[PDB]
Ligand binder design. Structure first.
Ligand SMILES: CC(=O)N[C@@H](Cc1ccccc1)[C@H](O)CN[C@H]1CC(C)(C)Oc2sc(CC(C)(C)C)cc21
Length: 377
């Protein structure tokens, strides 16, 4: 379809889709964020913005006379709410009127050279700012068009420049192989899921499974890393250390604050373990596992200055706000946000990035006898 390959990005800086806002249409690149629910676009000059939404030029702009403030994990923005016409040139062939936050100030939000000027929050109204009566974009799209209430994401991030597809209203079979496995959306606010087991090199971390979901677990295209609650993060780091102990790395590396570097072409993929995350299935006590390679959790950092080497950041980090299944872990899966059936599907994507020894996988079913609910609260 004309929807394939409509995402672009730079590694670590998010993936974006081209959109238009206003009439006549103004073209902007917009970050695709399943971890939030506000649609906001740069609307005043900023050093890092190539362009921005000029409301004065749009005859369809309607001002809502209400300010809005959104604080994320590090960055934040503030702006003014209004509505306008919005299209996605390489998405469905439709036009919708949607809420739009016109960002007028921000701190640590825009990224120097990222090539996007806005953010599309694809999560549910419950977490929209100022409050849940601010209808999110996807909800407006569904209410206003015949578009089925589902979207899928194939994030590739191949080899600085990355790409992918966002398919709205459907499942494109050309984008995955093998089966689709579904995990229930536990609560419609973030895309909240439940992890029931974690293995490193097939070794179970042996924790009460509530710990994996302390205090929610989410699927978040707007966060780069796999983020893990402290207790789980330290347990994981210990095993991955143990598995790779033929080489020793500085603590700074494990903290995500220092690169590790090897002479180009010589990264020792084989010393690093795979990581399996088992997700609650659609039937009681059944699960499936998604298995991730170090090619996804060792994120390359492109830098012409360090380019006699290949250099990497460790893309697993600690969270005090729950587990976040970020871009790391979505890359090389085809992930189906099936809102209509309150579930999220995972399959191996046409762009999985594997060894001649190992491959990322989505596989099941697994059964557990332990009658314990893994949901935290
Ligand atoms: C790393 C990050 O903060 N990603 C944001 C999206 C973003 C993209 C580019 C620049 C800055 C931010 C993503 O929305 C974060 N997703 C969740 C993650 C969690 C750990 C649950 O923390 C937060 S706070 C938040 C904003 C509200 C939904 C609370 C308004 C969304 C999220």
């Amino acid at each position: 379809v004309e929807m394939v390959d409509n995402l672009r990005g730079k590694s670590g800086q998010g993936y974006y889709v081209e959109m238009t806002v206003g009439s006549p249409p103004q073209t902007l690149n917009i970050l695709v964020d399943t971890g939030s629910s506000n649609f906001a676009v740069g609307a005043a000059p900023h050093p890092f913005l190539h362009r921005y939404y000029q409301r004065q030029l749009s005859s369809t702009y309607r001002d809502l006379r209400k300010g809005v403030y959104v604080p994320y994990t590090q960055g934040k923005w503030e702006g003014e709410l209004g509505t306008d016409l919005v299209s996605i040139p390489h998405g469905p062939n439709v036009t919708v009127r949607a809420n739009i936050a016109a960002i007028t100030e921000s701190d640590k939000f825009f990224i120097n050279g990222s090539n996007w000027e806005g953010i599309l929050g694809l999560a549910y109204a419950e977490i929209a700012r100022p409050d849940d009566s601010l209808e999110p974009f996807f909800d407006s799209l569904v209410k206003q068009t015949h578009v089925p209430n589902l979207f899928s994401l194939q994030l590739c991030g191949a080899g600085a420049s990355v790409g992918g597809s966002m398919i709205i209203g459907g499942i494109d079979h050309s984008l995955y192989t093998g089966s689709l496995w579904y995990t229930p959306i536990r609560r419609e606010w973030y895309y909240e899921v439940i992890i029931v087991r974690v293995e490193i090199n097939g070794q179970d971390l042996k924790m009460d499974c509530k710990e994996y979901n302390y205090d929610k677990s989410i699927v978040d295209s707007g966060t780069t890393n796999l983020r893990l609650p402290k207790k789980v993060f330290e347990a994981a780091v210990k095993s991955i250390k143990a598995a790779s102990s033929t080489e020793k790395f500085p603590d700074g590396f494990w903290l995500g604050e220092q690169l590790v570097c090897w002479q180009a072409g010589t990264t020792p993929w084989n010393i690093f373990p795979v990581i399996s995350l088992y997700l609650m299935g659609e039937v009681t006590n059944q699960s499936f596992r998604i298995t991730i390679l170090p090619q996804q959790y060792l994120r390359p950092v492109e830098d012409v200055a360090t380019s006699q080497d290949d250099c990497y950041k460790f893309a697993i980090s600690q969270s005090s706000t729950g587990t976040v299944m970020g871009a790391v872990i979505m890359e090389g899966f085809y992930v189906v946000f099936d809102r209509a059936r309150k579930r999220i599907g995972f399959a191996v994507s046409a762009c999985h990035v594997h060894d001649e020894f190992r491959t990322a996988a989505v596989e099941g079913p697994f059964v557990t006898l332990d009658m314990e609910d893994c949901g935290y609260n």
